[PDB]
Design a protein around this ligand. Structure first.
Ligand SMILES: O=C(O)C(O)(O)C(F)(F)C(=O)O
Ligand SMILES: O=C(O)C(O)(O)C(F)(F)C(=O)O
Ligand SMILES: O=C(O)C(O)(O)C(F)(F)C(=O)O
Ligand SMILES: O=C(O)C(O)(O)C(F)(F)C(=O)O
Ligand SMILES: [Mn+2]
Ligand SMILES: [Mn+2]
Ligand SMILES: [Mn+2]
Ligand SMILES: [Mn+2]
Lengths: 301, 301, 301, 302
């Protein structure tokens, strides 16, 4: 019997108390660090995938192949951490949304989210978004739900709406209701603009687990994880938890290297140290375990 | 016709006053950030490829597919900037050394490096490394040379040897010699153990450009670029330039997130901020030029 | 001094007397076979690709990754042989049409066609098609011409319209001329319905090279290369010239393997014969010239 | 729960009565065709993958990435039909054999085979084969077996040796044995020189279910389905069963296209027909059921 984190994430979002905290990772390393810090959930950012795999802004540039491989490898770094993964708008219509679902399920991906934008989608905290009508939107969600059923996957279907910005509060809620009716599992109102409004969605969709996108310095005012739990939310996501820090530091680092002529990393950061963050030691156990002798001796010095 | 940065680097390699300084990057973000900071050349670390793409240590886990893809994107962020891309051992015998060359060429890679380890390779600063003999190795260096000139490519072939730690300085120099005769453009003594030895290679192989691999806190004492230039090297790489610092900053930041429950990114790090680092302005022009409406009134909130 | 069939074909189309016959190929095998036949050009069918890569119909399930990979590899079987690569609707808006143009050009592709359906397009001989408005289409062509030009590519842009069935003859022509004005290299009126439309269109955009798509037993009367040349076409393609016969042959061989329980391939299908169809001899030479003893001996017996 | 055709097959293999007939497919077309002919199992040929995905010979060109992708798409067309996928040598040492085992399980691959060649392998019917040593090889086998249990897959680890051409019959059987020992489920003596040795090897490795690779016009004399069943094989594969014919038919099609200046395909082959061979109807039902109307009025021309 093979296992997926969809299952125990699914049980937790059925327990009305357990609260899910998920930092936003974008590649192998951010995922290894966020694990070491002791988080019990990860979020694979679409934006961060764009950044790292393409060097590109969050503009629909990422392909299903792109997202799925990244989502996959992030999922099996630790197969019991549920991974919540971006899936943008489904990489097409029903035919495509199902492949994405099927794919993300086989991959061990614990949840994903489908938004209501046109396929050449935009970061949610960006102006001038373009949406698809409610009918097409429900059709994506209904495909993802029917797709998981057919293969018996527990993968958690998260319905994002980007419509607040363009269409007003009332309409985004009509969309979330309509996604709840097609069988979605969690509701995702993107870019909540106020505490009044976080409070107001939660009651308007009372008893449906909702998710908060705590992207900072965008449309959404700062809510700590505790306050969100307390407000009623069931999941909070921090898409730039890794990406932000990593940018500031590399920048300073490259400017330092520029004036200086050598990086000057702390003497702690040895290649073995750096490798250990990426599972060196577990990787050599695997070799010694199967009769191999390549890491005979260790690996220092 | 189409241009590649092979020809600049190969040209610059001929003027013996030009000295190529290339920091390590390992994904799009590090790349854009290295570029933003004014570097004239980039080095894509294999180790860093393994870590960001796979979350794995540097042990030959990366496939040609992984490597090339990552090489092409990094190379095309800024087409006029030369990129020296790790090619491990050529991912096979000659047949593969050859596809490796052609594909890196087509990708717009400016230079690459092939070493004398078994395919199932390992970072050069760990104990244990297992090598192939001199003939096989030369076969690889010859395969790259032949495949480049067969397609009319100016990509720069860097001959590396990982054989100092087990076979001794003398052998290491003998393999560089063979390689030089086989037509490599640049010598790569991995894991130079002293300044004595740095000055010494340069002399024993005088006339022939050499790379210094400036990985700190490993086998090589800390030599700055200015100093390497003065010794007589032609290229200096720093594989962990972005990676060390990103690992530190993210570890920090994830620890903060865990205690704090909100990441607290500096206010300067809006979503737009971060996309703008990843070419958002330019992506927005392509559209407008083409001329699209998507982006109309930009994206600011 | 890297080179590309794109430029060879650019030139062909500059002289109106040149006539181009390009059979459909969909994978490495079809490609080798068609090359062995002596054909001077290839057409990588999108439909085709979907069937081999995915085991799926032509419904817009291939992503850019799929199509670029296939196109590149086909293109580099015989680098001197121009390959006309299907490129669907460009895999998104302008941003993606450039990435498509850039990648295809780096891959050695000679030409590609962009059409005017929605991104979840279907084969042009199915009913139903859904189209985007003319402006949105022109925006695509325009991005490919621009993208071409920013990078100095000679790649041929082929403007397709699927508008005949839904909008009729004259809207079709209107769209085509609109694309010509945007810098497109070749017109492509999908599923022309009569031999006199054939001739009407050729004088309707006279001076401008036109492609005939000779897919049989859908929408288009059966017209030959001789006949097409005479009519005044510049390029004739046959998406299923390899595909169909392969299907039918495999169908019959699977029944016969069904009943008889041993395939009974002809005495000449040895493994080695099959391999020589795919460059065994040439890639054994690659090795030797390097050279290892890998195939030292030969491979036979 | 998601269900793997690897279980249905593990269990089929405990039945001493179940004989598995598996034709070699290599792309989606050749999968879809094999299925409709009614086969209950498919074989992904390593060789055929090289040819179709790369245009290249069977020489170690394919990377794990390559092979997994084909193996995955091929398993999931009919997800209840077991797919036995080539795995070459496992693309490196344990670490890599582990990843291969893992990815092939997630993909739905029913079985995969691992050989004792150098990682730059060649078709086991070419000369020149250069092997690795027994220890090294058991390390590979033991790793796919440990990887498999670490994650709880039913995936069937087939053990293959190429050592017959190079090191003789008795060494060939020593290797195959060392490997039953490290936990492999199915044995694969590749390139059987004669029919009395096909009879012999079953005897020598009684207890353990074996696979015949029936590649025609190489080293192995031609032995049929019922005939290998009788002798006592559990699995027979025909790696070129899709690819031989396709080559012959395409060569002819090209000659005809020069002769006639048009393929002259049969009235039967409408685009629709070929598409339906590729599951177009299934595809269109997925859209309708999800509420999409993209295929309203259907898709046959009017
Ligand atoms: O992380 C993401 O990709 C995202 O979709 O959640 C987002 F943050 F960019 C967003 O659009 O909000
Ligand atoms: O960065 C690399 O991949 C490298 O090869 O330069 C190295 F640093 F890992 C090394 O092997 O020294
Ligand atoms: O081969 C193709 O992909 C094609 O676009 O030309 C076609 F045949 F499918 C078609 O749409 O005519
Ligand atoms: O199909 C294959 O790749 C194969 O391994 O079975 C073979 F036929 F090439 C072989 O090695 O015999
Ligand atoms: Mn996103
Ligand atoms: Mn390296
Ligand atoms: Mn097409
Ligand atoms: Mn094989």
């Amino acid at each position: 019997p093979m296992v997926t984190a969809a299952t125990s994430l699914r049980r937790a979002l059925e327990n009305p108390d357990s609260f899910i905290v998920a930092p936003g990772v974008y590649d192998g390393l951010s995922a290894r660090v966020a694990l070491s810090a002791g988080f019990d959930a990860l979020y694979m950012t679409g934006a961060g995938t764009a950044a790292s795999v393409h060097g590109q802004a969050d503009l629909g540039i990422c392909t299903l192949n792109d997202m799925r491989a990244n989502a996959e490898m992030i999922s099996n770094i630790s197969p019991s951490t549920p991974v919540i993964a971006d899936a943008d708008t489904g990489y097409g219509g029903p035919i495509m949304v199902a492949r994405t679902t099927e794919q993300y399920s086989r991959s061990g991906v614990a949840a994903f989210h489908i938004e209501d934008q046109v396929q050449t989608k935009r970061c949610g905290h960006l102006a001038g978004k373009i949406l698809v009508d409610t009918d097409t939107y429900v059709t994506r969600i209904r495909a993802a739900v029917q797709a998981r059923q057919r293969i018996g996957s527990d993968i958690v279907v998260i319905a994002r709406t980007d419509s607040l910005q363009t269409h007003g509060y009332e309409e985004s809620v009509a969309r979330l209701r309509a996604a709840r009716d097609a069988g979605a599992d969690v509701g995702f109102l993107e870019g909540i603009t106020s505490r009044e409004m976080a409070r107001q969605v939660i009651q308007d969709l009372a008893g449906w687990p909702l998710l908060l996108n705590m992207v900072e310095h965008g449309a959404t005012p700062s809510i700590s994880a505790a306050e969100a739990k307390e407000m009623g939310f069931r999941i909070i996501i921090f898409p730039f938890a890794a990406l932000g820090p990593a940018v500031a530091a590399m920048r300073e680092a490259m400017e330092k290297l520029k004036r200086d002529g050598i990086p000057g990393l702390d003497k702690e950061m040895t290649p073995q140290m750096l490798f250990r963050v990426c599972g060196l030691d577990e990787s050599m156990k695997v070799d010694a375990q199967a009769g191999g002798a390549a890491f005979d001796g260790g690996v220092d010095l």
